[PDB]
A paper describes a structure:
[name] [name] has been studied extensively for its potential for cancer gene therapy by reducing the prodrug [name] to a cytotoxic derivative. The natural substrate of this flavoprotein enzyme is not known; however, it reduces a wide range of nitroaromatic compounds to hydroxylamines and also reduces quinones to quinols, with a bi-bi substituted (ping-pong) enzyme mechanism. The enzyme is a homodimer of two 24 kDa subunits with an extensive dimer interface. The two active sites are on opposite sides of the long central helix at the dimer interface, and the FMN is bound to residues from both monomers.
Our most active mutant in [name] is [name]/[name]/[name]/[name], in which the additional [name] mutation enlarges the small channel to the active site. The structure of this mutant was determined at 2 Å resolution. The side chain change of this additional mutation is too far away to have a direct effect on the active site of [name]; however, the [name] mutation enlarges a small channel leading to the active site. In [name], the main opening to the active site is as shown in Figure 1; however, there is a smaller opening to the site, approximately at right angles to the first one, shown in Figure 7. In the wild-type protein, a protein bridge, formed by F124 and Y68 side chains, is above this small channel so that it is only large enough for solvent and small ions. In the triple mutant, two smaller bridges form between M127 and Y68 and between N67 and F123. However, the mutation of M127 to the smaller valine allows the side chains of Y68 and N67 to move slightly, opening the channel. This could allow larger substrates to be accommodated in the active site. The steady-state kinetics of reduction of [name] with the [name]/[name]/[name]/[name] mutant shows the highest kcat of all the mutants to date and a much lower Km for [name] than the wild-type enzyme, so it should be much more active with the prodrug. The quadruple mutant has the highest activity in the colony-forming assays in [name], with about a fifty-fold increase in sensitivity to [name] over the wild-type enzyme, similar in magnitude to its decrease in Km for [name].
Numbering used by the authors:
A (entry chain B), B (entry chain A): 2 to 217
Write the structure that this text describes.
Amino acid sequence: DIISVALKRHSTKAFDASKKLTPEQAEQIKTLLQYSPSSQNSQPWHFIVASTEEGKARVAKSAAGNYVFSERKMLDASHVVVFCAKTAMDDVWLKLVVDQEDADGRFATPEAKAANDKGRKFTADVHRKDLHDDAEWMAKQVYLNVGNFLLGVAALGLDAVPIEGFDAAILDAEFGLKEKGYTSLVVVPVGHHSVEDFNATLPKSRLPQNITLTEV
Amino acid sequence: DIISVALKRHSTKAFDASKKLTPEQAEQIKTLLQYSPSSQNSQPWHFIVASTEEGKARVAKSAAGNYVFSERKMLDASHVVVFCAKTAMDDVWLKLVVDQEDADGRFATPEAKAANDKGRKFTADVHRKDLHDDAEWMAKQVYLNVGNFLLGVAALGLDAVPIEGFDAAILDAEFGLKEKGYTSLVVVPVGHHSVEDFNATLPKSRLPQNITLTEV
Ligand SMILES: Cc1cc2nc3c(=O)[nH]c(=O)nc-3n(C[C@H](O)[C@H](O)[C@H](O)COP(=O)(O)O)c2cc1C
Ligand SMILES: Cc1cc2nc3c(=O)[nH]c(=O)nc-3n(C[C@H](O)[C@H](O)[C@H](O)COP(=O)(O)O)c2cc1C
Ligand SMILES: O=C(O)c1cccnc1
Ligand SMILES: O=C(O)c1cccnc1
């Protein structure tokens, strides 16, 4: 059951390099990434999935220097996912989203399609013109995908760890993200933990509900 | 299987008001909220869980004006969760987190406790003093909790919808959040969909992976 998974999952501190995802697991993690929800189904994201040693080495360049403890995680995991957010809101993307919704058969009429597009544009306009927070808004949706992903991969029986401990400017330059209109936010290595993962046997710790939660 | 869950879940557009969470499901959703991961185990969040008519009516005040379509969802769902983020980083919270980790038995020595606290404080200081983005950073963690929650509730067999379509200023004032140092970000009604939920029978739509995903 999913509660057992939420209580048993942990942030892996060390991965077993000999243990690779099955072909089926590799496809499943890509499905999890794709099918996350997002505000207005905006999907304001790109994913880099590194599974070769060369690919993972390129991602790990971002952990050089101050983030050296992140490096082994990045190199030793089977697959490494880099979660990127769109930095500017392009109208091309919004059209792409609604054209895909149309192709998938979500609209009964042209008028329903037009209304969906109008709603999405309105929301995007509120964030960019009224709140001046569109970059933040898009990044929040990516963090939502990360949360979905971490629970999903645990429910597949895989070990993972979310990493903010890397240099985003280096990762951006390594993959040319700035010019494509993306920024890297979170790196998530995925695989199986090794016997050196000290966190696997430690109790989980959270604040009590009487501190964080009010019932009304 | 979790992939089936991710592919079958949907944003509910209409709830069945007669269909309530079981007592056990109500406890399980609160556990999901508590046990989400967060950067540095910072847990920079508060949750309001409304299950009474009075409670849910208070939340639904925020679905006024531009947000009237959110009102039915908030009133008709069994339980409504408001996800709030801390707005100022208080040192009291950071001390509380590490004191809880200590009580749960995560540290072998006083030196390991001190190092954990030092790391957490360093990270918090980078966001507040160097990046000037601490509010954004805390809100990102709450969105991560939301993504965890949405998949978890689906795996429990419950329907949900995430809502950004509400008036946060009204919700903040209704519960006195500003003075407590929180801001409401996302409202998630939880329950069972009704036969009027038009989204339950529509195909799910996402951009193809050849647009959103690069393998390296
Ligand atoms: C957004 C995010 C960023 C994180 N960054 C790191 C990181 O850079 N290095 C690391 O060792 N752990 C990292 N963690 C793991 C957290 O410390 C961990 O989630 C938290 O202590 C709760 O423990 P758990 O994940 O075992 O439940 C990160 C977690 C999240 C959610
Ligand atoms: C952060 C967030 C905010 C959302 N806000 C709303 C909302 O205000 N009203 C609504 O009807 N749906 C809202 N949605 C639902 C999205 O439109 C939805 O996730 C997506 O279009 C439909 O895909 P799904 O059925 O896979 O969730 C929100 C989704 C997310 C992730
Ligand atoms: O996804 C939606 O339908 C949505 C998102 C934000 C605001 N209003 C609607
Ligand atoms: O949670 C952690 O261990 C963490 C978070 C950010 C950066 N470095 C470490």
